């Protein structure tokens, strides 16, 4: 069992672009130096979210075929995947223990003024992802599959997005057969993680709406990206 040269090329373009994301030093130093309070902790979370959106757009632009889609469909895909992609990257950071600093960052997220209604399913999902011992190829492919979802709202030409997502699902299933021949349900488990990611959309949107204009968490820039 091997990937075809066409599949190897598609995977290499995805892997190269995914490897470009790096946690900036100034954000890392903030986790180490800032006062441990709800206000300071949330401000660090906000900075991490704005850095991730920029990273996500750069990654998405290098996805084979993304730039060939209708300009408004590109926006619709970025808008619709922003939250899911952030939780998937957060799962990767948790299970790779980044900035390495990880226990301090976890302590800040748990004391940022965010309710346990949203924090508890968050860490439960990271633990669930951790159990699958996902390779970097799996994180990158899953991120590309989340972004290139043809059933997002406001997409005009859905079959165009389908033509881009289907070869990625083909590569991912092939990598499961190559690297886990003893576990035939590994691909099904990864799909299981995709549906769990989709639940963070409602949960995250509900969390966002709840923040009052006078609350320290109220952030107009966060609202614009996430909705």
């Amino acid at each position: 069992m091997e990937l075809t040269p066409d599949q190897q090329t598609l995977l290499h373009f995805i892997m190269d672009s995914y490897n470009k994301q790096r946690m900036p030093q100034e954000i890392t130093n903030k986790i180490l130096k800032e006062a441990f309070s709800a206000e300071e902790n949330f401000l660090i979370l906000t900075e991490m979210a704005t850095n991730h959106v920029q990273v996500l757009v750069e990654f998405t632009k290098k996805l084979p075929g993304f730039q060939t889609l209708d300009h408004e469909d590109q926006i619709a895909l970025l808008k619709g995947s922003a939250v899911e992609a952030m939780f998937l990257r957060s799962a990767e950071i948790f299970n790779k223990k980044l900035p390495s600093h990880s226990d301090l960052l976890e302590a800040r997220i748990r004391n940022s003024g965010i309710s346990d209604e949203y924090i508890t399913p968050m860490f439960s999902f990271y633990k669930s992802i951790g159990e699958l011992k996902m390779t970097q190829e799996e994180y990158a492919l899953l991120t590309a599959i989340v972004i290139l979802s043809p059933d997002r709202q406001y997409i005009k030409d859905r079959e165009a997005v389908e033509k881009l997502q289907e070869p990625l699902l083909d590569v991912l299933q092939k990598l499961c057969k190559i690297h886990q021949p003893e576990n035939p349900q590994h691909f099904a488990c990864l799909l299981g993680r995709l549906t769990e990611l989709r639940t963070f959309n409602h949960h995250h949107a509900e969390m966002l709406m709840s923040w009052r204009v006078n609350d320290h968490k109220f952030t107009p820039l966060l609202c614009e990206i996430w909705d």
């Binding site: 959106v53 920029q54 757009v57 750069e58 632009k61 590109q74 926006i75 970025l78 808008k79 820039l221 614009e224 990206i225």
Partner: peptide
């Protein structure tokens, strides 16, 4: 609408 995302997508 979505001015930040538009800028990020269209920049070089």
């Amino acid at each position: 609408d979505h001015q930040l995302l538009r800028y990020l997508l269209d920049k070089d």
